[PDB]
């Protein structure tokens, strides 16, 4: 096993060990997830409106 | 009142461990899909290791040792043997064997060429024991299973009772194509023997019997000559893999029934062929070897309100 | 989500709500003047829930009292802590409902429902964050069933968005006032199917049952049953008035334990089950406890919990306990009705503790079922409902206020469209 | 010097993060004033510590993080607690309503009301950080909040900060210590939509953690405050890197660079060694080698998994206390011969080793014992997809009935997002099987 990277400070130090080697949507479409889902809710309290008003 | 499932109706050696559960009135069966088990009789695949030992309250075991598809696979086994310091490429039991992806007589899982095994392979290659002992009155070919049952603990208990499972036809080394003489599995010997059934009732000899016979025939005893090399094997192999399968310290416990079949040359060296993960059991000894798992590999993990094992200390 | 508006409406309704208030007013600190008295601050930490302060430091309970006849509200204000009550939240008529869903519903009930929202509006002006309603009323009558169903459905219209929890009781023949009780029970649970989150179904045949099987008493008044409903309506409410590891709210108790919108019928259950004035000198153990309230003869809607499958369970145990051995006994009554627990939804019993013991018991249990055996109580209501039906009796009682026959055809359809999707969750 | 600001979102990442900045000052010797004696540079600097603290003209030094919960209940009590004056008031950042165990609950309908205002506080401590790193967020898998708001949030900070690292510290569900019946939904869904955004996530199962106070702690019924001092032990062992000279994980980057080969398999495994109960008064200290030992045996897991049954793809050992390259090298080769570890074959077997001198603090009077020397280790190993496995079995279950799906749909949430979240954990599991099977 090789040791590679020594660094060491006053607080410690590091190294690494080798064993082996080897062998995103726009703010706008945010809204549009965001606002499209406020207008379902709106749609479905709206049908229960609707609904108690018959 | 302990809770189990059943995940492999095909299973019965386990069939038989749900009924004698079902009858000490202290075991509840489920729905296979009931996470709220203390046993399950997993299945044979895919069984979802990674869901055990995360139910609040409940200490579970299951009937299967992750991992021990190394050693119950042809092709990981040779692996294994190869690969393993403990178990060596020296390895004195174990036949030599090769893997292949798609006297000089060797067997392809039998042929003496070359070119005619690796057609066939594209259509494990293992030594062929050329000179196997061979049973009296008869000149036939057999091969031994061994029951061995491995605790959440990892105690190895080999069952005192073993079976020979024999070819009724006697052994010719001129052609291989015959099969019948050179192929030792239950199944084939009754749609493939005429001689099926003449000498041992269903080609299966137990060890009483092979013991008086090698006392009478080879003056010698069958703990001796060949259970002593047997008992190692076992040993061996379980040994090797027990830091790799061990449930120790897991979140859920294992034990495991395992099938060893050996092979005995004519100079009574027993020689490894294969180790089964999910055996089934002779019939006269489901009885015994049923109750058995349940004592030793059960209540010891669920108590309840001589032995018929042998203990392989390691 | 803090204070909660209560309405009781007939005669019902007030008078399991007006001992409801004198119990935990009692478990609370406050007195019959409505001053506190306590010694435990934890009284107090979430004494909003159902009471507002005033000046003088008083604490007036959040309560609106409803019925078209004033005889019982009279009875409340000669109660014991009949003047806790803010006496502007009275709304009363003067004609009555005579035991008709009609009259409650569409005639004498509207008359007066516009004035009852005037005081609810009212209180909850004043509330921060306004969780919801709780509303106590029976079945079986006109104004509880009736009126209260019209509320119900006018309350949603003005505060959509708001919790509604109701304390249901279950007409019963070995209980009953007047034949027509299947009527006004089979009108109102269609009204509760669609306008409420939460029901806690009381059957007066378990509350009748479990005082002559279990409490010996021969001949069971209405005061003997108010006891057991007493005590449930302060174990249920515990964990939403009182700090604890479980600070429950409306909304938060319906989301878990409601896998369905319309299967919002719960089974109540209660143990150690107690006479009232009876002193008990032996408290249960925790496995008593534990066994007890899954226990069918503690239930206090008359279903067999064996005939159904839990789909969702609530314990709340009170009074100084192992939590170690409550988490034991809890798995091992799991395992007992492991049978009884569908497989399809993890982890669905919840338990929680609640330190201050009751008045008079020094541990219990309060256990909340949401169970597909329920179906066995509607069932029973549609069969005396289709009794009657099939012959149109006693029907132009409810003609004569308007109604047709078309809509108790559709009050039978819906109860048995409940029934049977019930039973589809039952084999799931 | 560059800054990382933590974020703290529902009740999980509020109580957890109390713990956390606790030990962080107990650490650097910050006392609940915000006062630091050892500081001798007032009001500014450029060391380590400063990464997590800024200072004040009066000498007061201030975490840079914001703690967000949609109820006012939690966090008031951080208003109110030892630790007040550590923070200005505008980083506590508290609603009226929660998310009730919802998460469309706390992504749609309340998030979207509060989600600028968090913004808006976030870019106030952008502002007073000259190389700003990234961010830090705690929060929880099953809660309302710390599901549907995270991943909101999470959403947010990509377009605002595109050029920053964003590593999580999540709460995997335990029916041990559970308070929702719908967690396993809430987690698919989070996970589902937090997936693209998170560069990094240290998963901690209660249940793991649950375990680990029971047997090791000896508490019989462990409390919120048990975990969540377990918890801030290995948050600590995780960004001490950042707070203190060295040269292992110096910057949020390197924590991806060093763990995460596959940005979607971003998930490492975390083993802390010991934890000894302050109970005992004699308990002999392990040495290296029993600590690094240790980090293989399942039962110190912040997962419960089985290693044996997994590929890794990257090994880091932090240490803290006395230890030495030559003993840790010294129990690697121990190890390597008396375990199997199985790396991927397209990339080296090795182990990245820290060691930071200062002995891991405790806080006084908790029940976790002084030691000299700790280790965690941060393995990314294919066995955590176990976990995934269970959350997802859990999730069909419940979503083949459609059971309270009801509560998301009147949100304003789709079905059609239940589905989607589902079939992204599916590929999320082909992706681990293909990589270590
Ligand atoms: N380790 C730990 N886990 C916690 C803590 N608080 C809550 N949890 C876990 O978080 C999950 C519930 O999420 P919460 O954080 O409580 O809910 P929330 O983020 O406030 O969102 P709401 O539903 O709106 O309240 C449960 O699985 C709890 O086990 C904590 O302090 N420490
Ligand atoms: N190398 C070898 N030398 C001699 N005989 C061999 C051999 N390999 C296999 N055989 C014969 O083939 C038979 C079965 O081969 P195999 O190892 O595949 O068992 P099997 O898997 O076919 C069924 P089972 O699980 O019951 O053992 C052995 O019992 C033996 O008689
Ligand atoms: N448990 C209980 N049930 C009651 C009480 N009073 C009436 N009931 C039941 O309620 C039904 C009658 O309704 P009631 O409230 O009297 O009529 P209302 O005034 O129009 O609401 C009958 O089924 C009674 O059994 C009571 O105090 N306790
Ligand atoms: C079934 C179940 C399974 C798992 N987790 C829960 N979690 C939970 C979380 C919050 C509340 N809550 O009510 O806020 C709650 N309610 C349960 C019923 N309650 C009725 C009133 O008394 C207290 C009990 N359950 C519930
Ligand atoms: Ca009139
Ligand atoms: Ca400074
Ligand atoms: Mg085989
Ligand atoms: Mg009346
Ligand atoms: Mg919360």
New interface residues.
């Given amino acids: ?1 090789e ?1 590679i990277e ?2 060491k ?19 706008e479409e ?1 809204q549009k997830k ?1 606002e ?6 709106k749609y ?1 309290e709206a049908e229960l409106l609707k609904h108690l008003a018959e | 009142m302990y809770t189990f499932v059943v995940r492999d109706e095909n299973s019965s050696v386990y069939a038989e461990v749900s009924r004698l559960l079902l009858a000490t009135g202290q075991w509840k069966r489920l729905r296979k899909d009931n996470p709220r088990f203390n046993l399950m009789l997993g299945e044979r695949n895919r069984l ?4 055990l ?2 139910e ?1 309250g409940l200490v579970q075991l299951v009937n299967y040792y ?2 021990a598809d190394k050693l119950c696979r042809k092709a990981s086994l040779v692996k294994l043997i190869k690969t393993s310091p403990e178990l060596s490429e020296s390895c004195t039991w174990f036949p030599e064997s090769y893997v292949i992806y798609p006297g000089n007589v060797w067997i392809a899982k039998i042929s003496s060429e070359a070119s005619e095994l690796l057609d066939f392979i594209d259509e494990v290659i293992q030594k062929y024991l050329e000179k196997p002992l061979l049973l009296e009155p008869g000149h036939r070919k057999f091969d031994i299973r061994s029951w061995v049952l491995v605790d959440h603990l990892y105690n190895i208990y080999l069952y005192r009772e073993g079976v020979l499972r024999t070819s009724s036809e006697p052994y010719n080394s001129a052609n291989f194509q015959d099969k019948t003489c050179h192929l030792t599995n239950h199944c084939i010997q009754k749609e493939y023997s005429k001689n099926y059934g003449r000498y041992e009732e269903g080609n299966e000899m137990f060890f009483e019997e092979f013991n008086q016979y090698l006392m009478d025939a080879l003056n010698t005893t069958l703990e001796n000559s060949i259970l002593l090399q047997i008992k190692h094997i076992i040993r061996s192999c379980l040994m090797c893999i027990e ?2 399968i061990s449930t120790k ?3 859920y416990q294992s034990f495991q029934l395992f099938g060893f079949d050996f092979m005995v040359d004519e100079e009574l060296k027993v020689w490894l062929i294969e180790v089964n993960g999910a055996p089934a059991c002779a019939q006269k000894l489901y009885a015994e070897l049923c109750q058995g798992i349940v004592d030793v590999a059960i209540s010891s993990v669920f108590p309840l309100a001589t032995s018929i094992f042998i203990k392989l200390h390691h | ?1 803090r204070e909660i508006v209560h309405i009781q409406a007939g005669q019902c309704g007030n008078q399991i709500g007006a001992k409801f208030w004198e119990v935990i007013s009692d478990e609370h600190g406050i007195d019959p003047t409505g001053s506190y008295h306590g010694d435990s601050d934890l009284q107090l930490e979430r004494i909003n829930v159902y009471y507002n302060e005033a000046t003088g430091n008083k604490y007036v309970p959040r309560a609106i009292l409803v019925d078209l006849e004033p005889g019982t509200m009279d009875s409340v204000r000669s109660g014991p802590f009949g003047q806790i009550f803010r006496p502007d939240n009275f709304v009363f008529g003067q004609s009555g409902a005579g035991n008709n869903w009609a009259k409650g519903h569409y005639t004498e009930g509207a008359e007066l429902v516009d004035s009852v929202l005037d005081v609810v509006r009212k209180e909850s002006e004043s509330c ?2 306004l969780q919801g309603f709780q509303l106590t009323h029976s079945l079986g009558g006109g104004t509880g069933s009736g009126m209260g169903t019209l509320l119900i459905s006018k309350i949603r219209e003005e505060y959509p968005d708001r919790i509604m929890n109701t304390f249901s009781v279950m007409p019963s023949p070995k209980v009953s006032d007047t034949v027509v009780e299947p009527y006004n029970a089979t009108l109102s649970v269609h009204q509760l199917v669609e306008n409420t989150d939460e029901t806690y179904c009381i059957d007066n045949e378990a509350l009748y049952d479990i005082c002559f099987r279990t409490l010996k008493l021969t001949t069971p008044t209405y005061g003997d049953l108010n006891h057991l409903v007493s005590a449930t309506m302060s174990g249920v409410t515990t964990c939403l008035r009182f700090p604890g590891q479980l ?1 429950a ?1 409306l ?2 108790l319906a ?2 334990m ?4 319309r299967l919002h019928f719960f089974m109540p259950g209660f143990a150690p089950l107690t006479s009232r004035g009876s002193q008990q000198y032996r408290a249960l153990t925790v496995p008593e406890l534990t066994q007890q309230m899954f226990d069918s003869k503690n239930m206090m809607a008359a279903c067999d919990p064996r005939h159904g499958r839990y ?2 369970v609530a314990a709340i145990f009170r009074g100084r306990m192992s ?2 051995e409550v988490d034991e006994q809890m798995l091992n009554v799991q395992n007992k009705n492991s049978s009884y627990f569908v ?6 019993v ?1 338990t929680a503790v609640c330190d201050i013991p009751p008045r008079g018991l020094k541990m219990s249990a309060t256990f909340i079922g949401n169970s597909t055996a329920i179906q066995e109580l509607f069932k029973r209501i549609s069969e005396q409902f289709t009794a009657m039906f099939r012959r149109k009796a006693f029907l132009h009682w409810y003609t004569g206020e308007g109604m047709d026959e078309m809509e108790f055809t559709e009050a039978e359809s819906n109860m048995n469209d409940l029934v049977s999707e019930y039973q589809q ?1 039952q084999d ?1 | 010097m560059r800054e990382c600001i933590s974020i703290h979102v529902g009740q999980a990442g509020v109580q957890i993060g109390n713990a956390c900045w606790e030990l962080y000052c107990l650490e650097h010797g910050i006392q609940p004033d915000g006062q630091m004696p050892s500081d001798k540079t007032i009001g500014g600097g450029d060391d380590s510590f400063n990464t997590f603290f800024s200072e004040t003209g009066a000498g007061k030094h201030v975490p840079r993080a914001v703690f967000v919960d949609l ?1 006012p ?1 939690v966090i008031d009590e951080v208003r109110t607690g030892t630790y007040r004056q550590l923070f200005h008031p505008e980083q506590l950042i508290t609603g ?3 998310a ?3 998460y ?1 609950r706390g992504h ?2 309340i998030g ?1 009301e509060i989600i600028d205002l968090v913004l808006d506080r976030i870019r106030k401590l952008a502002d007073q950080c000259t190389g700003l790193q990234g961010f830090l967020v705690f929060h929880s898998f099953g809660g309302g909040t710390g599901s549907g708001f995270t991943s909101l949030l999470m ?2 900070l ?2 605002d900060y ?1 050029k920053k690292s964003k590593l999580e510290f999540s709460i995997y569900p335990a ?2 210590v ?1 308070t ?3 967690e ?1 939904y809430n987690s698919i869904l989070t996970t589902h939509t937090t997936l ?2 998170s560069d990094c996530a240290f998963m901690v199962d209660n ?1 793991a953690i649950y ?1 680990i106070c029971r047997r090791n702690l000896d508490i ?2 462990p409390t919120y405050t048990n975990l969540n001092r377990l918890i801030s032990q290995i948050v600590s062992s995780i960004t001490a890197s950042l707070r ?5 994980n110096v910057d949020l980057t390197e924590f991806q660079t060093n763990l995460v080969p596959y940005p979607r398999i971003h998930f490492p495994l975390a083993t802390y060694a010991p934890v000894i109960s302050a109970e005992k008064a004699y308990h002999e200290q392990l040495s290296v080698a029993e600590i690094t030992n240790a980090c293989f ?3 110190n897991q912040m997962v ?3 290693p ?2 997994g590929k890794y793809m990257a090994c880091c050992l932090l ?1 803290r206390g006395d230890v030495v ?1 030559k003993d ?2 010294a129990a ?2 121990t190890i ?1 011969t ?3 570890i199985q ?1 991927v ?14 002995p891991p603090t405790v806080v006084p009077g908790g029940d976790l014992a002084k030691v000299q020397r700790a280790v965690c280790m941060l393995s990314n190993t294919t066995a955590i ?2 976990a995934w ?2 959350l997802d ?2 999730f069909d ?2 979503y ?5 799906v ?2 998301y749909v ?5 079905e059609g997002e239940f589905s989607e979240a589902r079939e992204d954990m599916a590929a999320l599991e082909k992706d681990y099987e293909e990589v270590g099977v």
């Fill in positions: 096993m040791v020594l660094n400070c006053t607080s410690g130090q590091s190294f690494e060990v080798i064993l082996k080697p080897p062998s995103d949507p726009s703010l945010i965001l499209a889902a406020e207008e379902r809710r479905q | 979802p290791f990674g869901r030992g995360h609040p992750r991992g830091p790799a310290h897991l979140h | 989500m921060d964050c600070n709210d909304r938060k989301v878990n409601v896998p369905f919108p789909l969702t939590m170690k497989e399809w939804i993890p982890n669905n919840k969750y799931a | 109820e209940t009226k309503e929660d009730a165990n919802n469309a749609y309908t979207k959403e947010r990509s377009v595109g029916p041990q559970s929702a019946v719908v396993p693209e955004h249940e375990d019989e019924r203190f000279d060295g040269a292992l045996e399942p039962a419960k998994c089985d044996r049954h240490y390259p840790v090298n690697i080769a390597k008396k375990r199997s790396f074959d397209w990339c080296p077997t090795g182990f990245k080793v820290g060691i930071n001198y200062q997809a176990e496995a269970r079995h859990k279950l419940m083949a009935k459609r059971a309270f009801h509560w009147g949100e304003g949430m789709e």
